[PDB]
């Protein structure tokens, strides 16, 4: 791993072969699945001891064929609003107590009622496994089955999802909190596959239409019905190879408009968000920077947790990866020893690249006034030489991001003792901070590019010439300085 993996990928054929080999290397072995099955069997035994006629259904990463080494083992146990909430929570604590106190080998048992779908986190010591026990999630089961079915429908699915998942983990695009879940990312890949000119994957509406006799199923008021096998469904006529589809993925999701679109896997289509239409239809949908609709429960946005910074970092990293995919280093293999193809994508992100990927949130303001205020801040308030979404090239011959404290203190003392410089204000900012900058003091020391997107309005700062490698300091400083600059500039109206 991380060593054997590198040489395994570098040695084999073309890019697609690298993706497939990656799938073969990351996927669970027969022993891991056997162990998981045994643990699930034990859980089943104890839960049957407590709940006669209860079924333990593994869901999530285990049964969806997207499994990787060390992945979570998620178990669904199958057996007045706040009374219902409290009852569900009580049942949850019941199951949690059964886990914590009865079944052999399990430790680390923590009840999580506060989550969207309440769950009991558990760890099993002897097998060295961990996961979530869900009381009610019946949807995760069906959509997991939908994922495995998606893998069975076309062979390129698993390579694309595995490669893009590893890449996302590498670019810091995936995880908990503000980041994208593996499920959300998977649904994004599948959506991409649905929207290709020849479709690679069918729309979920088409699957529901096909369905089958007795294959009809309804969960929580939603239609989960799809064909159980891929044999009753015609294959894809899309001939595009793995690498081409990867590059197309990067380019596509780089060029998409995420705020103005709710991506539907059911209709295999982009539904306009603005204004109000999908939020009026399903009534439960939370709209945000990135909107990706669950194929079954349509009131649920799987990406709804994603902040503007995370979506921005996503599209930036995708544009960069698309810029790499066009290069010869990607398409063609290497003679001896050099990194090619998938390797630069899976390799860890440079701090400069990691910081330049995630943009800087700016105060709300009209695009023109915002750009004007920005270039005014760089030009006037800083020593930046600037030149002409929007973008500008900026050059700094000075250390201006650092040393402002000492200089400001010196100016404070000098002005405290006697007459200083300035223009009389009730809190003006620009000119004063410009003086603070100018009191800190022809090849450019550090040169960088600033870029603002139309929606949402955010500044992306990427390096150009950085001989001394001081760019990240500048980036942090800008993260702090620019928002308050625009903030004080908004109060001049
Ligand atoms: Cl497209």
Residue numbers in the entry: 145 to 223, 329 to 637, 763 to 815, 826 to 877
What does the paper say about this structure?
Therefore, the amino-terminal putative zinc finger (ZF) and RNA recognition motif (RRM) (amino-acid residues 1–140), the predicted disordered proline-rich region (PRR: amino-acid residues 235–304) and the carboxy-terminal region (amino-acid residues 651–750) neighbouring the nuclear localization signal (NLS) were removed. The truncated TUT1 (TUT1_ΔN) was overexpressed in Escherichia coli, purified and crystallized. The form-I and -II crystals belong to the space groups P21212, and P21, respectively. The data sets were also collected from the apo form-I crystal, and the structure was refined to an R factor of 25.3% (Rfree of 29.7%), using reflections up to 2.8 Å resolution. The TUT1_ΔN structure consists of three domains—catalytic palm (residues 172–403) and fingers (residues 141–171 and 404–598) domains, and an additional distinct domain linked to the C-terminus of the protein (residues 599–874). A comparison between the form-I and -III TUT1_ΔN structures highlights the mobility of the KA-1 domain. The KA-1 domain rotates by ∼40° with respect to the catalytic core domains, using α14 as the axis of rotation.
Thus, the present structural and biochemical studies have demonstrated that TUT1 acts as a U6 snRNA-specific terminal uridylyltransferase.
